Structure 1
Amino acid sequence: DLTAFREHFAKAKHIAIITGAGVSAESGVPTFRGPGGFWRKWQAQDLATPEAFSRDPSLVWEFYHYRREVMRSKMPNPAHLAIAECEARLGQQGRSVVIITQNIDELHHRAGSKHVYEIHGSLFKTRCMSCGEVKANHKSPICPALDGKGAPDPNTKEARIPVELLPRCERKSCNGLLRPHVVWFGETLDSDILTAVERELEKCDLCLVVGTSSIVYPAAMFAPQVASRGVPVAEFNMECTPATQKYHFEGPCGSTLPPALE
């Protein structure tokens, strides 16, 4: 019931919005998980690990370069924009909106959202494997050796770029190999980020879960905590629920969300 949701929305002083891959799939952005989610022979699972990076860093960089380069043509969608403009409008009234996103595509930033927690990192940040420094990077191509590489067709030959020529740390005395500042499979989420997220969730009085589910991860971490404070949680996602089923708006969030958040 949209009207009942909007009654809560009108009153809410602190809204937490959690976003998953559905909001990024609708911008034309491949996940690489599941059906057709291949890049050359591999799926995300096979590449987004420290073992892949240790054993074939050129291959893993080709994959991330491809993804960075594809983002240039993908644009934020009406769901991302509604979220950003909602934050702006409510912020002017002293009402707080924060976005907690699983997505690494930075589309929320491009849409205009300011208060964003990227819990899985970003395609457009690097971390130095030597000195640990994190730096924003939108350079196209990230380094000359990667220029025009990363083709996704399975019979593409590997670039086999020497490690010295992959993206390097620019504080010249270090010069360490850079990696994407993304959380990989088998790695822990940042504790500092999680403590900030816990504080926001504990203060919020309405929570939305967009393009994922309350019951899958990462949403399953957060949303119980908010529900147990008695706070309404509203899902916007394409997934069905039974009819023998706190709010669920079924469909593409780029349709549902601008209406719900207007």
Structure 2
Amino acid sequence: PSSSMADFRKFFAKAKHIVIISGAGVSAESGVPTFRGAGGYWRKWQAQDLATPLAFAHNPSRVWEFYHYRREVMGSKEPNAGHRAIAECETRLGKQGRRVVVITQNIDELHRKAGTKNLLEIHGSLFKTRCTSCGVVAENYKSPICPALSGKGAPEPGTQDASIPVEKLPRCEEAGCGGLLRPHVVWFGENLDPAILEEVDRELAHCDLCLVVGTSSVVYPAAMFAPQVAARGVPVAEFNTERFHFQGPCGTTLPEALA
């Protein structure tokens, strides 16, 4: 894997269809606490205790307490230089008829806030809700999402469970529904949206340059996508903190690389 910026910039100049696969490193550079490894903890629990349809069935109040916490910490965050370079490149290239798409594992909408428009959110968004009754997906940025969760969601073990009755958790506001809302987030056991994967696969089939940013291509989810682009002879440029590999924060490398 080459570290030549000049050699990368030569493909970048000529690339008509760029696919940027964006991992958690991009979000972390904005102060988003990465909910994986040593960080994958809230009170007594891990992600596999919280982010599952079975968890939501047994204790939706606890799952909503956690996602309220997640929403609260996320909504105070701002796009970083990497997010900005990525958006500015899409805007700039688009005026020339050249394409940039972002595939993100992240659910904080920081790419959207930076100005990214060709955005594929494979894990959904925690600022979207899904109704478990009618199936309607809705935007929700409200703080707090419901009055019962006001002041709730503290991460300390020993914090009392809110034990909010289901009726008082976030409810659908479609006329005549009133169903229980869940976060519009892909949980363990649940498949990624087939329509999204369809769009993703089309982009990978047509791209002439691929970027992996804030993650590596040997790890989920970039490991799903980058190998088949590379096997086609399309250059894959990797930007992370340890064909092309560029070391350092994406906020440092991407502004220059995507200039």
Query: When the two structures are superposed, what TM-score results if normalisation uses the length of structure 1?
Result: 0.96
After TM superposition, the structure 1 = structure 2 runs for residues 137-148 of structure 1, keeping only pairs within 5 Å, are 137-148=140-151
Structure 1 residue 31: Cα displacement:
2.0
Partner of 2:178: 175
Structure 1 residue 25: Cα displacement:
1.1
Partners in 2 of 1:27 and 1:203 — Cα distance? Answer: 31
Instruction: Give the alignment's Cα RMSD to 1 decimal.
Output: 0.9
Partner of 2:123: 120
Q: Secondary structure at the match of 2:191?
A: coil
Structure 1 residue 37: Cα displacement:
3.4
After TM superposition, the structure 1 = structure 2 runs for residues 175-254 of structure 1, keeping only pairs within 5 Å, are 175-239=178-242, 246-254=243-251
Listed as ranges, the gaps of 5+ residues in structure 2 are none
Structure 1 residue 227: Cα displacement:
1.0
Partner of 1:7: 10
* Percent of paired sites with the same residue: 75
Partner of 2:40: 37
Q: Secondary structure at the match of 1:7?
A: helix
Deviations 1:79-102 (A, max 9, x none): 111000110111111110000001
Partners in 2 of 1:41 and 1:259 — Cα distance? Answer: 42
One-letter identity of the residue aligned with 1:232 = P
Listed as ranges, the gaps of 5+ residues in structure 1 are 240-245
Structure 1 residue 75: Cα displacement:
1.0
Deviations 1:153-194 (A, max 9, x none): 112111100000100111131111000010001110111111
Q: Which of 120, 130, 133 matches 1:130?
A: 133
Q: Secondary structure at the match of 2:12?
A: helix
Structure 1 residue 129: Cα displacement:
0.4
Structure 1 residue 32: Cα displacement:
2.1
Contact 1:213 1:235 in 2 (8 A): yes
Q: Secondary structure at the match of 2:225?
A: helix
Deviations 1:9-64 (A, max 9, x none): 00000000001111111111112211243211222222101111011100000100
One-letter identity of the residue aligned with 1:101 = T
Partner of 2:30: 27
After TM superposition, the structure 1 = structure 2 runs for residues 158-173 of structure 1, keeping only pairs within 5 Å, are 158-173=161-176
Q: Which of 57, 62, 77 matches 2:80?
A: 77
Query: When the two structures are superposed, what TM-score results if normalisation uses the length of structure 2?
Result: 0.97
One-letter identity of the residue aligned with 1:76 = P
Contact 1:33 1:45 in 2 (8 A): no
Structure 1 residue 120: Cα displacement:
0.5
After TM superposition, the structure 1 = structure 2 runs for residues 41-52 of structure 1, keeping only pairs within 5 Å, are 41-52=44-55
One-letter identity of the residue aligned with 1:159 = A
Partner of 1:243: none
Structure 1 residue 203: Cα displacement:
0.8
Partners in 1 of 2:84 and 2:202 — Cα distance? Answer: 25
Contact 2:33 2:39 in 1 (8 A): no
Partner of 1:92: 95
Partners in 2 of 1:30 and 1:43 — Cα distance? Answer: 14
Partners in 2 of 1:6 and 1:46 — Cα distance? Answer: 44
Structure 1 residue 215: Cα displacement:
1.1
Q: Which stretch of structure 1 is more off in the superposition, 221-230 or 56-65? A: 221-230
Structure 1 residue 252: Cα displacement:
1.1
Contact 1:87 1:96 in 2 (8 A): yes
